[PDB]
Amino acid sequence: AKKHYFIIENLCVGCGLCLDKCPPKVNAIGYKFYGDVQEGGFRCYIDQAACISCSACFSGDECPSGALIEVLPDGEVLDFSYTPPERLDFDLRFLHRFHREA
Amino acid sequence: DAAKMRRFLFQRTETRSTKWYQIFDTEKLDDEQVVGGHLALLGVLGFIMGIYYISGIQVFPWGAPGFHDNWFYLTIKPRMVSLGIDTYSTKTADLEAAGARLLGWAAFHFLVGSVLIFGGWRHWTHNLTNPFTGRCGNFRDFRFLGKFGDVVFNGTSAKSYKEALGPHAVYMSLLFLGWGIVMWAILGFAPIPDFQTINSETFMSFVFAVIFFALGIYWWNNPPNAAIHLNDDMKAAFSVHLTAIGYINIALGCIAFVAFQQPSFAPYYKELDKLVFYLYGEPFNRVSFNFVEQGGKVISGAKEFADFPAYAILPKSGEAFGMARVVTNLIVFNHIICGVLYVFAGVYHGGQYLLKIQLNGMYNQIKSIWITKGRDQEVQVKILGTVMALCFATMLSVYAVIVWNTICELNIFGTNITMSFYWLKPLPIFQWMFADPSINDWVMAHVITAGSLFSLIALVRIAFFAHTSPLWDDLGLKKNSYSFPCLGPVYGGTCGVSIQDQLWFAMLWGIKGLSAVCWYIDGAWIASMMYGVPAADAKAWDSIAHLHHHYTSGIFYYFWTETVTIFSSSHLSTILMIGHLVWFISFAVWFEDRGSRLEGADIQTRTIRWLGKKFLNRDVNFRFPVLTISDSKLAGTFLYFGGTFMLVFLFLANGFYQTNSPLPPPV
Amino acid sequence: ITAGSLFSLIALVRIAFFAHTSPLWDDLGLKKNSYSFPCLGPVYGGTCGVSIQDQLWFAMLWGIKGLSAVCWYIDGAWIASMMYGVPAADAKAWDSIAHLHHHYTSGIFYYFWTETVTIFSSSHLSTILMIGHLVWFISFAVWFEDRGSRLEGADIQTRTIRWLGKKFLNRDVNFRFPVLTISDSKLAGTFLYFGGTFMLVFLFLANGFYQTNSPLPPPV
Amino acid sequence: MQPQLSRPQTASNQVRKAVSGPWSGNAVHKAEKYFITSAKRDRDGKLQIELVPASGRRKLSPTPEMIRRLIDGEIEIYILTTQPDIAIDMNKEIIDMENRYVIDFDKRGVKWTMREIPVFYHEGKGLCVELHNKIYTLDQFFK
Amino acid sequence: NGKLIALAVGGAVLMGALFFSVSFLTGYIPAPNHSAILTPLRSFMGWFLLIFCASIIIMGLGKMSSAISDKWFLSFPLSIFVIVMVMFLSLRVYWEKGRTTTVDGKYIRTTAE
Amino acid sequence: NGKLIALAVGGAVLMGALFFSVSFLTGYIPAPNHSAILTPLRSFMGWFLLIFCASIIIMGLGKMSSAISDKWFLSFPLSIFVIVMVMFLSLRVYWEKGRTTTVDGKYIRTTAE
Amino acid sequence: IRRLILAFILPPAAVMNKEAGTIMLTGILTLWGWIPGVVAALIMISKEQS
Numbered sequence A: 001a002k003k004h005y006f007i008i009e010n011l012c013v014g015c016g017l018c019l020d021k022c023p024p025k026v027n028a029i030g031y032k033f034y035g036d037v038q039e040g041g042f043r044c045y046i047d048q049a050a051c052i053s054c055s056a057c058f059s060g061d062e063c064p065s066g067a068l069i070e071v072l073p074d075g076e077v078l079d080f081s082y083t084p085p086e087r088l089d090f091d092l093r094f095l096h097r098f099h100r101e102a
Numbered sequence B: 001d002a003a004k005m006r007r008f009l010f011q012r013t014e015t016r017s018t019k020w021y022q023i024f025d026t027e028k029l030d031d032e033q034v035v036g037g038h039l040a041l042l043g044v045l046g047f048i049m050g051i052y053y054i055s056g057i058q059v060f061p062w063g064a065p066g067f068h069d070n071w072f073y074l075t076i077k078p079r080m081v082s083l084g085i086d087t088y089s090t091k092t093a094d095l096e097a098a099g100a101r102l103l104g105w106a107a108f109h110f111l112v113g114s115v116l117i118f119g120g121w122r123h124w125t126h127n128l129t130n131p132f133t134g135r136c137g138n139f140r141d142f143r144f145l146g147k148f149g150d151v152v153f154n155g156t157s158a159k160s161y162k163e164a165l166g167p168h169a170v171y172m173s174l175l176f177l178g179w180g181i182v183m184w185a186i187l188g189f190a191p192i193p194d195f196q197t198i199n200s201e202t203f204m205s206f207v208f209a210v211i212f213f214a215l216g217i218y219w220w221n222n223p224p225n226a227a228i229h230l231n232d233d234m235k236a237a238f239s240v241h242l243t244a245i246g247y248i249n250i251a252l253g254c255i256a257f258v259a260f261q262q263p264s265f266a267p268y269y270k271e272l273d274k275l276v277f278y279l280y281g282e283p284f285n286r287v288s289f290n291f292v293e294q295g296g297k298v299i300s301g302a303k304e305f306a307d308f309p310a311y312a313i314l315p316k317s318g319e320a321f322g323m324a325r326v327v328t329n330l331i332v333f334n335h336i337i338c339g340v341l342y343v344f345a346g347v348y349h350g351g352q353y354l355l356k357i358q359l360n361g362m363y364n365q366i367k368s369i370w371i372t373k374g375r376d377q378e379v380q381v382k383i384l385g386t387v388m389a390l391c392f393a394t395m396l397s398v399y400a401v402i403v404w405n406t407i408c409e410l411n412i413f414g415t416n417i418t419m420s421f422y423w424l425k426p427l428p429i430f431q432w433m434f435a436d437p438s439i440n441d442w443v444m445a446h447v448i449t450a451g452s453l454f455s456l457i458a459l460v461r462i463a464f465f466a467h468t469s470p471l472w473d474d475l476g477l478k479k480n481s482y483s484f485p486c487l488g489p490v491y492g493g494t495c496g497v498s499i500q501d502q503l504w505f506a507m508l509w510g511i512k513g514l515s516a517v518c519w520y521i522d523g524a525w526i527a528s529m530m531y532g533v534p535a536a537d538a539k540a541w542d543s544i545a546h547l548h549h550h551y552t553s554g555i556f557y558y559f560w561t562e563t564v565t566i567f568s569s570s571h572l573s574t575i576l577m578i579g580h581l582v583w584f585i586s587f588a589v590w591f592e593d594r595g596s597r598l599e600g601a602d603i604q605t606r607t608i609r610w611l612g613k614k615f616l617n618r619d620v621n622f623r624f625p626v627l628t629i630s631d632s633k634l635a636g637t638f639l640y641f642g643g644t645f646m647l648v649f650l651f652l653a654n655g656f657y658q659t660n661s662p663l664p665p666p667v
Numbered sequence C: 001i002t003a004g005s006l007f008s009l010i011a012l013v014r015i016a017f018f019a020h021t022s023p024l025w026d027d028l029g030l031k032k033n034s035y036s037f038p039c040l041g042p043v044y045g046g047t048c049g050v051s052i053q054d055q056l057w058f059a060m061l062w063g064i065k066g067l068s069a070v071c072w073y074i075d076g077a078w079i080a081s082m083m084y085g086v087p088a089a090d091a092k093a094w095d096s097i098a099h100l101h102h103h104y105t106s107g108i109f110y111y112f113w114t115e116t117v118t119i120f121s122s123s124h125l126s127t128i129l130m131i132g133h134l135v136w137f138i139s140f141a142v143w144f145e146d147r148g149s150r151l152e153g154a155d156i157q158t159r160t161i162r163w164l165g166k167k168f169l170n171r172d173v174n175f176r177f178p179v180l181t182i183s184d185s186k187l188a189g190t191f192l193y194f195g196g197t198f199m200l201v202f203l204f205l206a207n208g209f210y211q212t213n214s215p216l217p218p219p220v
Numbered sequence D: 001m002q003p004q005l006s007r008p009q010t011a012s013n014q015v016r017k018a019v020s021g022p023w024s025g026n027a028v029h030k031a032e033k034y035f036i037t038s039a040k041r042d043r044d045g046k047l048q049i050e051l052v053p054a055s056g057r058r059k060l061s062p063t064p065e066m067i068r069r070l071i072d073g074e075i076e077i078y079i080l081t082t083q084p085d086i087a088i089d090m091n092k093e094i095i096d097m098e099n100r101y102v103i104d105f106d107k108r109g110v111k112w113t114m115r116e117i118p119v120f121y122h123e124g125k126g127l128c129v130e131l132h133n134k135i136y137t138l139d140q141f142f143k
Numbered sequence E, F: 001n002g003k004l005i006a007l008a009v010g011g012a013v014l015m016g017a018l019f020f021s022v023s024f025l026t027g028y029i030p031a032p033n034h035s036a037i038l039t040p041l042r043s044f045m046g047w048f049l050l051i052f053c054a055s056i057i058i059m060g061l062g063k064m065s066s067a068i069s070d071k072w073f074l075s076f077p078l079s080i081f082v083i084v085m086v087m088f089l090s091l092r093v094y095w096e097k098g099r100t101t102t103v104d105g106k107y108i109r110t111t112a113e
Numbered sequence G: 001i002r003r004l005i006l007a008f009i010l011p012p013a014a015v016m017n018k019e020a021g022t023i024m025l026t027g028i029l030t031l032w033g034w035i036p037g038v039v040a041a042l043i044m045i046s047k048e049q050s
């Protein structure tokens, strides 16, 4: 289908939670090692030839490093199913009750 | 086919899962379902209270030998003697009345609990139809009771939890007044403001009834605002109330410990030392290998004593076995451990809700102070760092004091007990809260502070770093499951960062500061690890520090002394074995070995499949499942915590053995 | 002895065969290439402790039991049951019913009460006891699945020490707290566990025999 | 975050302002992360660069304002080498670069390796990406 | 299938017969008034019942999680409570039938001993 | 720098003036033949020595793990051996200066007691 | 004055200026006996003035 999902082998820490949600009948997600795993040398990949666009890896909302992206069918690249609204923040301290500022 | 296997270990994976131990998770429960569950559980509680009352029968007034003593009823017998429902009476005549009263109260609890369970079941099914009238009640808008439900709460049943606090407080005022009138009518005990008798309980029940009624009126007409607990009261309000109940329960344990030793409580607890107790599983009258029955008199194989025919349970005095403070310690430590556990669970469930609102952006959308404080990422770091620094200071100081005390006892490096911290007592302005204030009580206060701060470290890590931490902010990572055990060996390893694992670490850390209570309430001289041991100078504490009591033994020698009685009895011995068994099995799931277990279980599956063909026949498709590190940590925390506190119970329930005779120096 | 030898032989055989791959890891898309790596993360529900180093640690911890059996047999400590010589119901009746010519020290669990009266009576043995217990339980800080918790907390320690040293002391506090990686954590934990238990198995051995030849007539 | 409350060797690239940042947007990204999602050629030779945020809600362009927000250390731009508007043969360039240090136990990990490459702005040249010791520009060159 | 129980029971009875055979090979003096045939049979009964109870606890409590759900709001806690009450009544009608009294029948319930 | 060694000592001397100050408030009766001036100071010195020894052991065993290399072929076992020697000789010159005899000086070595 | 009396009586009450985490420090120091909290309150109430 459309909206391919991909894995960035630059944020991925190889936790495999994406692999846990990939259907066993399609081994879309896998492992590459290239070294010791104590130094992040166990990144994961998505075999785009086997991926059938389940959304399971991405919609599960478990990628901790934002390596799963789910590029949209046209061009849009997501990073997580929902993102907080990017709010301006400040600390509210009252004048002479509760707080006293200063 | 290597894929049919794959959707077998893709079944316990710690993704978002059903997790059978979350069927009653508050996310899928509404307010009325919570009401119904609590009502049904209170009915079951009444059932088990009736069962305990039945276990309290000693004469069965219709005529039969009664029940042997057990901790389930011995922990409440002082209360029933206080209420006049049971007696410390030496004669059968006054004990038949106590048995009849306990039987009647057990039947009353059975009936009331059945009614309560039926009501909770109907609330659980959203079926508030009155079968007698055929109408149906409205959970959202109901008259409370009738005319009383209109003069106060003029219709308009509470629509929100902050609006429900007030009607709840009026309900608790009704509970207080009902208990007061139950005292006054059924249990005698007119309300006299004499704060040395049970009559003061009725008087203060009426006083608290008035106080709670006024407070409920005020909070009905002026509901307070915690604001955020109104929305996800399933987890926010629930967890806040859980930690509040935990602190209340620790306070109740302290109140019990102080009160049960007072002279006003003497006819209920101290008088337990004038009784003889026949506990289930205690040393029974043994007989030789060739007993041939034929009662009345033993012919072959005379038993231990000619009395107590056959296999009767031998008597044990309440003075040598300090049943007074044994029951006091059982109650106090039960409520203290329950309070600590409830505080930990409240912090954990609050962290669960808080991660849930951090994931959907509601975290920044909280207005109440209780989150606008910790939404800083630096005040979080400052708070956790100062808690860690205070814990380090207190724990290092107290542990070095304990180690120096032990060194001076054993005279390691040629030291002496006069070099110890025997002079380090609480201040005279602090000596009022201890009897025989010494280095033991100072060490107890500092160990309580150190353990509380040590667990507070993980509690603060739950409260603040539910979704992200400054380490994981610096890394490109975020926590989004509250139950994931790890992200892997990346960065050298990411084990146990979720708030569930932080809860487990808080429990394990509070194990020390909580068992330190068991040592203390048993009088076990935590000021050093080897006390009362005849090695070099450990028996000189009573003289060098001018002690008035004589505590059992040091931290390590506590497992030698007072274990003379755990071993002396079969029931406590088998509890010891079971507790140790359950406890060390937690290593099979805490040790970083889950993948080894998975690999070995695959090997065993292939073996059983092959062993089912070489010798047996037919397919052997069954495969061995391995608990994942989320399940492994849950089961391990349960196994570890239960294994240690099935034997802390043994320390508590094997006797007091804290005589008031300070032994002289070895000289 | 047979059970413990075979039980540690399980880990030894896994070392000798599944050093690079196993039939489970053949069916997965995984291979072992480090002999010291601890895991591959929370994938497949977890891959903890699959290297030959970790299997060696498991073999050691498993042979701890079969070797404590040797300690308790050569001390005559009646490993045949968990209670012996304890006056509960019948643990003092073994020597009569079993027709023994020796009075073994105690049972398995009672072995820690008896033959410890002499450990306690001497300062040196008590100090060894305390140090062994301390070293042993410290191993939980690194064997438990807690390395990431320790790392997060250690970063908190670094930020605290540098915060407390910058605007209350002065100058940079560049030092950062190190945390043993899971491989280092498992190595240190295995040594801590093994030393903690066998610094006190020594106390079993070096505190007396106490296995007299007087078979304890039954209490009747 | 304050320098005295952070890990010692932390640069301003990894020091985040907006002290309560992690809960304002995605916690993974200290600064807002944008992706080059399309670079098409229409009419003239100039290419239209499309900056869609990691949130995937907008469809923006480099623009002087976002260029300033970039060079002020507030946003980050990546390309996702699997981008179909690429000029260099990234599939061969990724594969022959992993063949230096990756052993194909799975025989397909190198084949399906995709990574992000950051984009920086100098001024004289526009949004330019430095790849394989050579500085490519999105304007022509890299696409 | 019925072949598995025919082997679990078959294996249990085979190993019990093996215990009975090895009991005759070890020269031992039984208890004063006991039969050399029954006294190893009781031991094997205890051993097999121990392993079988462990199995059924693993077999049963593991299958409980596969069936526990929201529909177990009732009769799950009531089952645990009725287990309490059957155990408490068994500690009166099976274990320690009566209350400890001397051969004369006097209740030593206070410090009168 | 030097402010740390002015605070590690500064913190320790604070403990010296704090443990010694609270001994005069937590009213205690000292040892039969002892002075209240020095009896809290001895305990403080033992406590501080415990902490300082633990800290220096940690620092030393962390430093001789980054500094240890293949060049420590010698003087790694030789340092261990000389530590063993000094311990064994302190077992005779400082701790238990002589092999135990009676007050008269006689040796008892067999089961003649 | 009023603030010194507040610090002596309820040291957290006088110290509400400083921080969200400093107030916990003053409160828990007050929990430990009563002198540590008062000492912290006076120290950080004389620090913005002196």
Ligand code: G2O
Pocket: B581, B584, B585, B586, B587, B588, B589, B591, B593, B596, B597, B598, B599, B600, B601, B604, C010, C049, C058, C061, E053, E054, E055, E057, E058
């Ligand atoms: C009570 C103690 C233990 C066992 C009993 C045991 C049993 C076991 N373990 Mg273990 N284990 C630890 C304790 C125990 N591990 C600890 C403390 C650690 C941390 C160091 C630990 C660690 C690992 C790792 C890392 C691996 C294993 C395995 C592995 C399996 C091997 C399969 C086999 O050959 O059969 C051997 C199995 C038996 C002999 C079981 C027979 C029952 C008997 C009568 C004992 C009764 C059990 C219990 C006492 C009673 C409770 C019953 C209930 C009803 C009350 C096998 C089930 C491995 C596998 O799962 O696969 C190979 C694996 O990889 N472990």
Ligand code: G2O
Pocket: B388, B391, B392, B393, B395, B396, B397, B399, B400, B454, B457, B505, B508, C134, C137, C138, C139, C140, C141, C142, C144, C146, C149, C150, C151, C152, C153, C154, C156, C157, F053, F054, F055, F057, F058
């Ligand atoms: C003796 C036993 C223990 C400690 C001593 C301790 C200290 C400690 N632990 Mg621990 N720990 C366990 C035992 C001990 N955990 C176990 C058995 C488990 C498995 C359940 C475990 C697990 C975790 C997890 C998961 C985490 C931590 C941490 C954490 C830090 C918190 C910072 C703090 O409160 O400072 C307080 C630290 C002290 C007061 C240290 C001073 C003490 C003494 C006077 C010093 C003696 C030290 C030693 C006994 C002798 C060495 C001397 C030498 C000569 C031989 C803090 C250093 C956490 C961090 O790393 O930072 C937050 C973390 O995440 N743990």
Ligand SMILES: CCCCCCCCCCCC(=O)OC[C@H]1O[C@H](OC(C)(C)CCC/C(C)=C/C=C/C(C)=C/C=C/C(C)=C/C=C/C=C(C)/C=C\C=C(C)\C=C\c2c(C)ccc(C)c2C)[C@H](O)[C@@H](O)[C@@H]1O
Pocket: B392, B393, B394, B396, B397, B427, C175, C177, C178, F022, F051, F054, F055, F058, F059, F061, F062, F063, F066, G032, G033, G034, G035, G036
């Ligand atoms: C000891 C455990 C290990 C600690 C060490 C952490 C290191 C772990 C990190 C592992 C890596 C490692 O170590 O190896 C590698 C490297 O290691 C070293 O690098 C460093 C680590 C930077 C040096 C060590 C730091 C310091 C010098 C050590 C010594 C610092 C010591 C511990 C000072 C702390 C003392 C504590 C904090 C006590 C502070 C307590 C404060 C007081 C008591 C407050 C309470 C009293 C007041 C409130 C009034 C009391 C009152 C009164 C009177 C009346 C009534 C009432 C009611 C009341 C309450 C080499 O240099 C390199 O070469 C080597 O590569």
Ligand SMILES: CCCCCCCCCCCCCCCC(=O)OC[C@H](COP(=O)(O)OC[C@@H](O)CO)OC(=O)CCCCCCCCCCCCCCC
Pocket: B582, B585, B588, B589, B594, B597, B598, B601, B604, B607, B608, B624, B625, B626, B627, B632, B634, B635, B636, B638, B639, B640, B641, B642, B643, B644, B645, B646
């Ligand atoms: C032919 C090849 C061999 C085939 C047969 C071999 C397998 C046979 C094994 C059977 C028995 C297994 C040995 C034990 C297995 C063992 O010891 O390891 C612990 C085990 C975890 O094992 P794994 O799942 O890693 O692997 C075991 C594998 O054999 C199959 O799972 O289970 C637990 O965690 C127990 C906790 C269950 C949850 C209980 C939580 C606590 C509940 C309350 C109890 C405490 C009360 C509170 C007190 C604090």
Ligand code: SF4
Pocket: A007, A008, A011, A012, A013, A014, A015, A016, A017, A018, A019, A044, A062, A063, A064, A065, A066, A067, A068
């Ligand atoms: S979930 Fe994300 S971080 Fe984890 S293995 Fe998959 S792509 Fe990598």
Ligand code: SF4
Pocket: A005, A021, A022, A023, A026, A028, A029, A046, A050, A051, A052, A053, A054, A055, A056, A057, A058
């Ligand atoms: S979309 Fe489906 S097939 Fe593709 S990687 Fe995700 S789970 Fe696997």
Ligand code: SF4
Pocket: B485, B486, B487, B488, B489, B493, B494, B495, B496, B592, B593, B594, B629, C038, C039, C040, C041, C042, C046, C047, C048, C049, C145, C146, C147, C182
């Ligand atoms: S050792 Fe286990 S829990 Fe720890 S990171 Fe590895 S897989 Fe996860």
Ligand SMILES: [Ca+2]
Pocket: B329, B522, B651, B652, B653, B654, B655, B656, B657
């Ligand atoms: Ca006790």
Ligand SMILES: [Ca+2]
Pocket: C074, C075, C204, C205, C206, C207, C208, C209
């Ligand atoms: Ca021995």
